[model samples]
Target: MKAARIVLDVLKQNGVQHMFGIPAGSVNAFFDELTQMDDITPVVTKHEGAAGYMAAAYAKYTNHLAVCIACSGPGGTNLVTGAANAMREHLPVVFLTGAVPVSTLGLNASQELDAEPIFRPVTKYSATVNDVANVVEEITKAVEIALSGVPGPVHIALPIDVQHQQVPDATLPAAAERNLITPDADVLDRVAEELIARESGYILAGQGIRNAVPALLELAEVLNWPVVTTPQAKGYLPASHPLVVGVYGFAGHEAASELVSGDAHNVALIIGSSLGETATNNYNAAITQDRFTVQLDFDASVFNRKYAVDEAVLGDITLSVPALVEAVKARKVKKQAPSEGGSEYTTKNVLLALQQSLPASTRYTIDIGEFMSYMINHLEVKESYTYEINVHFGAMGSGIGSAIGSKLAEPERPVVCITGDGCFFMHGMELLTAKEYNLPILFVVMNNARLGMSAFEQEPVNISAMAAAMGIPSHRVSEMEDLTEERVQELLSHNGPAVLEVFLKDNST
Candidate 1:
């Protein structure tokens, strides 16, 4: 069989039902094989990067590994951003690239580039297939490693000559079983004993928490501890849950941050999060050694590499969490219910307005910005919801592409891409792609007008005039004379993709 056919068969054996990619000359043979395949469906994207991100989103939503294909050189490099995003977020993805040819290496042939090295840092593993004899085995191994343990993106570069070569029939390998590690019994007991002894404890959930939500939530309920999520962990726990403290950070609600940092808490249980600078506000001394920390993560290399932890468990959260919970329960530990507090205007008003304005079916694709931090912390998701954000790599223009991809993936859902002026302008042209596809998606541009997040790194300030200088129209509603519902509706109505630029002035004065 041709190597292209072998590759597709390998993908099928690995249970990949859908593939997203853009076709190029070096990869045409593989594309042809993919088209002829009975089980694998291919969705062509306008850009290779978007295709990669689309696959990432599919994998994230379904909890399955997704694949994206591209040709050599720029095609392969174009996928770097999305692949890196997936790897940083711990999403399992397979990136297949068709390279020039083995014989043409280092000769400066057309479209010749070192694809392996280019993707090395961003991927868990990267390699070029020099022979077709073991093509299936190589692909299977790459897939296995990519999905095993701490899942991440893996790249396989297929040389043109290797892809066209014929190979003998061979039995494909079975998907490797997940080998999950757990904390030691003694360590679990020590952590549980400490937790039970604390008068107040907080559970901080991050993206890592997604895998162990059931176990973590069970522990929270048993202890009646207040749970808080990072921006990436927004939907892990329903925001409406009384125990949820919302997200914690700069853009986090004032109430949530207060609850996390205030003297009321003596211990913090951090799960599946790195407690990175973005989430912790540059390692502020306030969240220092004062609180006992228990961290759970799959990647041991990251443990104690950055933030210090009192106790760390290096294993799959899905497995380690249940073990930890069982160990804690065995100790006959009892937890006190946390004291309830009244809501602040910052959290309550914003959440209430979003709940009323956003339809239950609305699919929100949030951009990377300070406002996004606020939205994720406050916005609530209803049943039958879809949303995307570039939390891991924090790519600025990804929100628009992600929205287009999400709409393509689930056309029945109403979609909206949320962005600040800076991110919106970075890839606003992507809206044309949505229009070309006749996708019904609303583009909501939060016209904070300046780089809100960057400004926060220094001081809070307004730049609406500067934004208008950069070509964004601003409507300043100062008095009752300026209010007009008809004008607002007219501004929002559009035959194609619409951009709603909201301008707000500083009220501190």
Candidate 2:
């Protein structure tokens, strides 16, 4: 097989059915190989950054490694933002970039840039293909590193000539397997018993609870523990869970804030989340001194970095949550009273309208803004994997790419992206991708027409006009009275990309 064939073979054997990228001169040979492959399909994106973001979101939404291809130089560099976002959230994205031919090293080849060094800090593994024989080995190793331990993005720079290099028919290495590894049964049982004895206990969950939700919720039901989801992990636990206390972040629920800060004896089982600034409130929610915390994550590095942890369990959540449930059932500590106590705050009409508008099957992809906080606090996620928040890397305009990736994963479901005017301005052009692909994603723009969240004013651009120019149907509502469920459906259920520019009315008058 040729080198490019091996690269695609390796990716396909590792279960990568779809790849996102743009064709460039450096990668045209790889693109040719991609065209020949029947098993793997490429979903081209307008920007390399958008490709990377879509790949990251594909990983997050599908719980599998994703692939994004890019050209050399600026093409590979453009992927940094999305790759950094994946790194922050521990998403598995296999980033492949075609680099300048190995023969052109130090000769100042056009569009040549060292991508490995640039991506090293942000990726779990970053390497350039130096030899044709070693290409498959390197690619396979990158995939292994991406899927192992804490899942994260990996970069593989395939030299153009090296990608075209051919080799005699040889067997490709079998794709590495990642089996579930749980913590010691005794350790899990002991820890589960220790927490169950506590009269007041709560569970702080992040995206790690993705697969463990069933078991986690079983235990939550038994202990009657309130589940506080991180902002990115808002839909990890369904709102149907009686004690589901919305997201914990700057724009999240105060009920959750009071719970985490209020409890001292109440053991908080922190899982998956790094408890970053907004998630932990500057480490305010992560308590020590008489408070107990058992943090579990696949990443050993996350054990004691942010908040205090009385015990650290490093293992896959799929098996760990089930193990903990088994231990809880072994009479280590009996499940007691329901922890149903919670504070109440009336939701405003803006968000109430949102709740009443969307379908239960809707996927909410929200960007960072003041309006974001309102959605986090009020959006009632009824099913698992229904919500997407992409600021894990602090990228401002994450909704556009994430919604694109999410809609690809669930093409039948209506993917509604709630982005602020500022966020939309940053990546609103991505709507063209949605239009091209015929993805019926509802882009609900909270068009305050300035940098409202940043407390700065800007030259306001009519987003609806921009959407129209981009070939997407758009409606602008200048009054809250105009923002109703009926009007929302007219925009949201358009069967293709549509923008709702809700002009946020300032009540300062």
Candidate 3:
């Protein structure tokens, strides 16, 4: 069997349906084999970085391993940023890059790079296959590590020569089983006791509990505790859920702070969040200091990293969350009325309007900017997994590629990319890829005419004209009333990628 065939076979067995990347000399053999296979579709992206983001988003959307390929040198390096983003977000992605022939590795051949070292810092695992026989083993290892506890991206470098090398046919081995970790029984009882003891407290949730949201909701209901999410976890629970207080940390709501700072609320249940700077609201002592704090997460590394905790529970969130519900119920804990969680809109009116205008099913791919802060706080997300933002790495232009991959993952659902002009200018040409594929994506560009997050202003460019030049349908809005539901629906109805450029005013005025 050819090495390329073995690699693709391994990925297919692991349920990779789409491969994103651009075809180049070093990866030509891999791309050729990809074209011959009907099971995996090769999505040619305009940039390798975009391909990385696409793969990451696909993984987030499907909860499966996603693949992104690139050639040697710059192509491989370009993927590093997105890989880092995926790693921070805990998305399962495999970044496969081509390398100079093993013989020429030290000979300074064109585009010769030590790929493993470059990707090592950004991925959970990184390795280069020097021989054809190692292809299956290396690829399988990459796939396994990517989906392991605290899921993250991995990297594999295959030489062009190695990709075309011939090897004896052999049956592929089954991938390793998931290493399931459950909570300790005694610890659960203790945590339940803590929860029961606290008459007033809140569940400080994070993105780590994304898959176990329903269980979290049940746990919250069982204890009748209000819930506050990290900035990245804004949509993990429905915004209107009675127990939802609001977002905490960067672009956070004041209600969340007040809830935690209250003298009566002395106990804090921090679950599945690393308590990073953005999520911790700059590590506010009120969250864990001078209080009984219970930290539960599948990733034990997060325990005691940021703040001290009274009890740390290590287990699979999906199981542990349900176990908490049972633990509380087993105690016959009296359920009180759901707390009247605070709600305050510090965000712009446009974000509120967009929330009301778009369908509840719409998936939002958000970029990092001043607008991101506003949207994260104000825009209501009706469902979990519908709000995708790479807030940790906070990469610009990530949302555009993520939106493309998300739309492909769920073609029947509406996908929208919310970005600022600064981000659009960074990788807006990828819209051409969307146009080529005829993907129906609605890109909402918040054109502040400058980098709204920065102090310096840049020369304004004609964003609508640029989209029109690309032959994509375009709309421009200068006022809140202009972005009506009918106008939004019209743009969403376009057969291909459409751009809506909104000229934002000085809201401070």
For all candidates in order, the CA lDDT equals 0.70, 0.77, 0.83
Q: Model 1 over residues 1-509: C-alpha lDDT tens digits? A: 89887888878877787777778889988888876788887766667777776777767766777889988898899999988888887778899998888999889878898788888999999999898887887888888888887788999999998889987766677765544565576777777888788857888887776756778888887677888766666656665466776666645555667776677778878888887775676666555358887888878877776667888877778877787788768776111122222333232233234344545767788888666764565466453234465566788877776776676667676666767667665666555555555666666555545665554332322333433453443343333233244433443343345544444322221
Query: Comparing candidate 1 with candidate 2, which one achieves the higher TM-score?
Result: 2
lDDT of 1 at 466: 39
Residues 1-509, model 2: lDDT tens digits: 77888888888888888888888898888788877788887888777787877887788777788998888998899888889988887888988888898989778998989899999999999999888888877888998889876778999999998878885554787886764555776778778778777767778787778887888788777677777888778877777667786677666676776666673447878776766776776667444435778887877777778666888888888888888887787774111122221222222455556656788888888787777666666667768877787545657678788899888876777788888888887777788888877888888887765675435876667888888988788888766566667877887767679988877644321
In model 2, pairs of residues that clash are none
* Two-way lDDT contest, 1 vs 2, winner: 2
Cα shift from native, residue 177, model 3 (Å): 3.5
TM-score, structure 3 vs. true: 0.94
Q: Which candidate number has the best lDDT?
A: 3
What TM-score against the true fold does each predicted structure earn?
0.81, 0.92, 0.94
lDDT agreement of model 3 with the native: 0.83
Arrange candidates by TM-score, highest first: which order? Answer: 3, 2, 1
lDDT value, residue 248 of candidate 1: 69
Model 1 RMSD, rounded to 1 decimal: 6.3
